[PDB]
Structure formats: structure tokens, C-alpha cells
Amino acid sequence: AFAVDAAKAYKDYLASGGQPITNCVKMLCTHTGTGQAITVTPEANMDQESFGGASCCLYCRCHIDHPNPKGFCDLKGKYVQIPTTCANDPVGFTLKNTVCTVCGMWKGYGCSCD
Amino acid sequence: ASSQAWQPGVAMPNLYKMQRMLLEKCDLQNYGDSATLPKGIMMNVAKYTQLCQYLNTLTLAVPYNMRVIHFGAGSDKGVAPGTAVLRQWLPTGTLLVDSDLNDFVSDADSTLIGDCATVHTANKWDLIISDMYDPKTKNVTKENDSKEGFFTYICGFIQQKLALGGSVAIKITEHSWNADLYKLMGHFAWWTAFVTNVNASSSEAFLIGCNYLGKPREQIDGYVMHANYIFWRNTNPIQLSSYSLFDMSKFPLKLRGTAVMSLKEGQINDMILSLLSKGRLIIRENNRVVISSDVLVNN
Ligand SMILES: [C]O[C]1[C]([O])[C]([C]OP([O])(=O)OP([O])(=O)OP([O])(=O)O[C][C]2O[C](N3=[C]N([C])C4=C3N=C([N])[N]C4=O)[C]([O])[C]2[O])O[C]1N1[C]=NC2=C1N=[C]N=C2[N]
Ligand SMILES: C[n+]1cn([C@@H]2O[C@H](COP(=O)(O)OP(=O)(O)OP(=O)(O)O)[C@@H](O)[C@H]2O)c2nc(N)[nH]c(=O)c21
Ligand SMILES: C[S@@+](CC[C@H](N)C(=O)[O-])C[C@H]1O[C@@H](n2cnc3c(N)ncnc32)[C@H](O)[C@@H]1O
Ligand SMILES: [Cl-]
Ligand SMILES: [Cl-]
Ligand SMILES: [Zn+2]
Ligand SMILES: [Zn+2]
């Protein structure tokens, strides 16, 4: 069946000079959190910014089916921590980067399990 | 800047509630002015953050598996900033349902799209937040009379789906208001009109009903109380402030583990009313939560 690949389509739209998805809901927090990638409550640290999950999910924002089997979303209802230097495009960050299964931090931005 | 600038907002003083003023036009001294918000923070994140900061000082009932419904949660941006704040503020395990006339993505457990009039629910709620506002209210062509529309629904929803001991926060403005809604505030242990310091240059306010008693504790004339609210806003300029936003250490709502009992109208004496009045008790069924949206069908 023809699968509409939107994950790469966005990487192509950006790489060709395109406006990143805005209106991502940034939250007010102490910035003294664990610094983990996805959390039930804002856990941004002094180097991060917390955002509402649903607002940072490409699938939710574009109203399209979710890759995860059953249509389960990993961001809706959670909060995603984004490095301040990459907070201008939270959606693009969640796609490109991956979360460490051990510590629960972003790999290359907090995960030091090696 | 008076000590009010350090509060999340300002509540209508008791002496203004006891007046009997006639409805005058609202003319704010700073109408139009905008507050300085923390870098990259949306107005509605700041607004809901101050509302929740104020709700923390009230005797809200907070049981395990608390039930919160949020009407008017959508925006022209397609996201729900206010719902994101409620998710942050409410204890984990709290059921949060939001709804709006237009489609939007939310962090709520469940979202209903459509006119609030089409929303049905078998169970009762512990907290109701309404940020509904009809854009047609901006067309003032006659006298400022009591508005109906979604307010009619909200009054019926509170009387039938609000748990005893439950609380409400309904958004109003100079022209977006209802007389029956002010009368219902008299069915709570306590009520007030709350103005956020970040939107102090707006006639906007949240009518807060604290601890629903199910019966009139006070006799309130809606037309008179709205005139009193306008008189208060016209005579008390509030200085725009976002200072309360820079301290989020005590933000989360404390889980009081309030008791939930399924009593009948015959087992409600004065002893029980005093517990409801202190957010020490919630009265409602504790069955599964079922919501539905009516779908009108056309050929
Ligand atoms: C998201 O949250 C929004 C806001 O936070 C909240 C309220 O916002 P507001 O603009 O502050 O409203 P207000 O002017 O303070 O009161 P009003 O009832 O709208 O008066 C209507 C009319 O009366 C006149 N007036 C009112 N006042 C108080 C005056 C004045 N004139 C003066 N010289 N001095 C004044 O003091 C003016 O001309 C107005 O147009 O409602 C939401 N909301 C607004 N618009 C929409 C919307 N939501 C969805 N779609 C919308 N289109
Ligand atoms: C904020 N609040 C006020 N009241 C009632 O309103 C009265 C006046 O309360 P107030 O808010 O008008 O002023 P005050 O600074 O005295 O508030 P306090 O810190 O509660 O004393 C109180 O004595 C209570 O009877 C309240 N009653 C209930 N049940 N719940 C509340 O959250 C609440
Ligand atoms: C001020 S906006 C809500 C903003 C939202 N609380 C936020 O966090 O950004 C008011 C909302 O009320 C909704 N609304 C107005 N009348 C309604 C009705 N009868 N039923 C449902 N929603 C309604 C509008 O669709 C609009 O999105
Ligand atoms: Cl106050
Ligand atoms: Cl906003
Ligand atoms: Zn999603
Ligand atoms: Zn790791």
C-alpha cells in the first residue's frame, strides 16, 4: 500500500529553505528538572525549554496516521524537553534525534552512557 | 507598583459585590496595553498559569482520579495552550477532557470537537474551566443585555453535571456575560471575579464558583452583579504584571486526596454542607467516564 512518508518530506521541506512548524506551546518551568527527553511534567534544565507534546508531534499537527502500531502517540499528554539552541524548531528536533532507553535523555544532548 | 503586581491577579473586593450600581459602559484606563511576557511565552500560557496560581489559594476539592472538563480549549493556531497548562498543573492520574467548536490538537485524555450544546456526559465533574467566547460579541449594535448561546448550556451543565464540592472558572467580558451564571455563583460556598495581571487591560475576568452546594446560599441579581463588576473595573485600574510567572516552584496543585462519597439528597445535612464548603468532600458517583458528541445528519 502507498504510505505517505511525512517524516522525510519535512526534512526535505526544511533542507530546501522552509519555515519550521511554529505555535509549539512552550511551558513556564523552574528549569531545575531531570533533563529527560519525554516526561509526564515539564523537566527542562538550565540548558532546555519544555513544550507540550501534542504541539510538537508532526502527526498530530498535520492530522495524519501515527507510525506506532494502534495509532498511539508518544508526545500527546507528555512534555518534550528541547535544547535552547534548537528550540526554534521543536518538531524537526524530535524527528531527527532519538531517546536513550537507559537514562531517558536525548542521544547527543545529555545521554552519557558511554 | 502596588503589592498586587506580585500576585497572579486581582479578585473583586467584597465591598463592590454588596453595591447596587446600574450597568455603565466599561472604559479601562489602560485598554489596549500589552504586558511584557517571558521570552517565547504565549499569552494564553501566561493567562492560564496565573489562573491556576490563583486557584491554588482556594479551598478546591482535589480527589484521586479527579475529573476536569475544559470548554473553549481550541485556538486559531490549532493548538490548546490552556490545556497544556492544566495538564502541567493537575496531579498525574487526573482525567482531563477538553472541547471546542473548531478542530485542534490537545494534550487532554480526550477531545470533543463541536458546539458545546452537542456534548453529553453520564458522569459528573469536579472542576469545569470555560474559556468560550463568541467572536460575534465584538458586534455591539444595541444595549449590553445578558447573552445566551453557550452560557445557556454552561448553566445547565453546572446544575446537572457538577459534583457537590466541585468548582468552576468561567471566562466573561464586558459584553460576553450571562445573568443566570452570576445567580449560580450564589449556589457555591464562595465566589469572585478574577482578573489575571497579564490581561489586566481587558474587561475579561473568570467567574470562580468555589465548592458547589447544589442550592442557593446567597440571592444574587445577575444584572446588578455585572454592573458592580464593570463599576469595579472602571474605578480600579490594574497595573499589567507578569511577575508571578517567574516563580513556578509552588505551581503544581497539591493532591488533597479529598473523599468522594455517593450520597442521596436525603443524606445531605448541615454537617455535610460544612465539609463541602472547605473542599474536604466531593459528592458524586465514581463510575466509568463516558462522553459523547451529537452528530446532526443532512441528506
Ligand atoms: C482569547 O481570549 C480573548 C480575550 O482575552 C478575551 C477578551 O478580549 P478583549 O478584546 O479584551 O475583550 P474586551 O474588549 O475587553 O471586552 P468585550 O466584551 O469583547 O467588548 C467588545 C467591544 O467593546 C469595546 N470596549 C470594551 N472595553 C472593555 C473597552 C472598549 N472600548 C474602549 N475604548 N475602552 C474599553 O475599556 C471594544 O471596542 C470591544 O471590541 O476574549 C477572547 N477573545 C476576544 N476576541 C476573540 C476572542 N476569542 C475568540 N475570538 C475572538 N474574536
Ligand atoms: C478565598 N476564600 C474566601 N472564602 C470566604 O470568604 C471570606 C473572606 O475571604 P476573602 O478572600 O474575601 O479575603 P481574606 O483575605 O479574608 O481571605 P482568607 O485568607 O480566606 O481569610 C473567608 O473568611 C471565607 O469565608 C472562601 N471560602 C471557601 N470555601 N473557599 C475559599 O477558597 C475561600
Ligand atoms: C479565547 S478562545 C479559546 C482559547 C483557548 N482557551 C487557548 O488556550 O488558547 C475561545 C474559544 O471558544 C470557542 N467557542 C465559542 N463558542 C463556542 C461554542 N458555542 N461551543 C464551543 N466552543 C465555542 C471558539 O471556537 C474559540 O476557540
Ligand atoms: Cl486579590
Ligand atoms: Cl495565546
Ligand atoms: Zn501525535
Ligand atoms: Zn543514556
B76 carries an active-site annotation: no
Q: Using an 8 Å Cβ cutoff, are B166 and B60 in contact? A: no
Neighbours of B242 (CB within 10 A): 20
Query: Based on the structure, what is the number of domains in chain A?
Result: 1
Domain residues for the domain of A36 are 1-114
Q: Are strands B95-100 and B67-71 parallel, antiparallel or unpaired?
A: parallel
Residues linked to residue B104 through DSSP beta bridges, in sequence order: none
B268: which 3 cell numbers?
A: 445531605
From B98, B100, B126, B204, active-site residue: B204
Please give the Cα distance from B176 to B135 (Å, whole number): 10
| Bridge partners (DSSP) listed for residue B127 | B68, B167
The residue from B98, B100, B131, B174 that is catalytic is B131
Cβ contacts of B286 within 8 Å, gap of 6 or more: B65, B260, B262
Q: Are B80 and B71 in contact (CB under 8 A)?
A: no
Q: Whose CA is nearest to atom 39 of ligand 1?
A: B138
This structure's resolution (Å) is 2.7
Q: Coil, strand, or helix at residue A25?
A: coil
B298, with CB counted inside 10 A (0-12, 13-18, 19+), is exposed
Q: Residue by residue, what is the 3-state secondary structure of B244-297? A: HHHCCCCCCCCCCCCEEECCCHHHCCHHHHHHHCCCCEEECCCCCCCEEECCCC
Using the atom order of ligand 3, give the atom closest to the CA of residue B132.
12
CA of B47: how far to CAs of B35, B105, B207, B263, in Å? 11, 19, 14, 37
Chain breaks after residues in chain A, where C lies over 2.5 Å from next N: none
- Identify residue B30 by its one-letter amino acid code: N
Task: Check: CB of residue B6 under 8 Å from CB of residue B243.
Answer: yes
CB A61 within 8 A of CB B115: no
Taking Cα atoms as reference points, which of B184, B120, B164 lies closest to residue B285? B164
Is B44 in contact with B50 (CB distance < 8 Å)?
A: no
In whole angstroms, give the CA distance from residue B236 to residue B231. Answer: 8
> Cβ contact (<8 Å) for B80 and A54?
yes
CB atoms within 10 A of CB A11: 13
